[PDB]
Amino acid sequence: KIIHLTDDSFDTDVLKADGAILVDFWAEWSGPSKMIAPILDEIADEYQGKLTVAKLNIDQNPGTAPKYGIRGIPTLLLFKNGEVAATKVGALSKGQLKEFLDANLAEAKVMSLLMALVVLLIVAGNVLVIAAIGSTQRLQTLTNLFITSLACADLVVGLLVVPFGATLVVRGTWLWGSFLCELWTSLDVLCVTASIETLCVIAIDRYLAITSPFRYQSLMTRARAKVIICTVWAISALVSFLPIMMHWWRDEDPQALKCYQDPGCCDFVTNRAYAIASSIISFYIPLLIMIFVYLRVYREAKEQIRKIDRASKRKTSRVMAMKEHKALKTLGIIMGVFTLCWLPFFLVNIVNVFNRDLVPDWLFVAFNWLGYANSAMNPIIYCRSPDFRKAFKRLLA
């Protein structure tokens, strides 16, 4: 099933070849080229009809490999209709090579459908929450004011940020010109900052309401909640629009200047100061507040069990009941999902400031998509109340 190429036959066997053909450049002296040979025998049989495996011995046929810039061996070039679709320079296992071939044979279609469901979950989920709070008199509580702030931030992520994001990934270029690149980038940072800062404010709201319910009623008014909400949006604006629209975020580097001059380029390139300052204000200060606050809810509940056991006069030791285990799960989901979604992106974002070439561009963009996924998660996490569930069923006919 494997074709054994020469220099003469290469144009007919590979460039003029029907469909997909995987070219292996190997040598009799190269130990990593012997290691892959028995894996390509299995792939030639298992991927029958999907691709053709072709082998070229570099010792016998030295003339072909320089034309495609072969620096190391074994190198596997997948060809599609006279052109090199995908490249590698290292030896692999059968399992790792199966994944590479599956990814490049199917023309990235999974990638595009996965953006579509993300937009659908974010818009459906958040419209349903704003509707539920807006329609139902019982849901218009002080907490649900902060939930409404969050719901709007995540909604604008689904309607405007993720779509224009999706297009830049698909087309590989920015079609809407320099201004809308700057406006879209500002709208991204605004809504992500507003979302994550409002998660932090919700943590503080629930902590006061749980640990200090009578102090919370007098201390947290509707007027004070409005001021807090307005402050989070004001901060979000002054970190997003003010720096991006006035070009303060701009790096001086000439490779960066080519992206700022070209309307087709909408790469997110920041100076060190903006990358740090925006990351701290959007994520790390909110994350530390949420860790500190939700820890004091755990400590309070644990210490309150100590008060119950102390007051027994050594009669009963309390164990975790259903209510405590559910509470501890809810705490797990809040910190778990928020951190999983946004820590990788903001960790990588601070790592680029130190050494630029360490983390690839795909990983950076992929982690930013994982952050956008949090906007779909937040309705699921923060709107589980019986009153929410009643209203959701009432709105769905």
Added chain:
Amino acid sequence: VQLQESGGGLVQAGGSLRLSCAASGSIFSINTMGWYRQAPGKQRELVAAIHSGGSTNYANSVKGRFTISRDNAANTVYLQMNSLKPEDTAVYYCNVKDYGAVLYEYDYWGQGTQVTVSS
């Protein structure tokens, strides 16, 4: 979770009663146990409430007269009601606000125990 109410009934004006509510069932460590009342032809209103943390909150009508406390170990809340007036006549309800959901509170209500103060 069941809220069993005792201690109510008939008492002369100037007299005292002691309501007790024993909450049998799974409640989160952090909670607020309380006494609400509904007088005839009025809406339900908070009498008194005591947080797990030991904070208290009383209606101005019952300040100085009524004292709310909870049992040191058990989920049992006591409203000692002194200097009772015919104004205080009402169906008194035990309430437990459980905070185990973290993002919302769950309400439990007692059936309610009649208190009638005569002049």
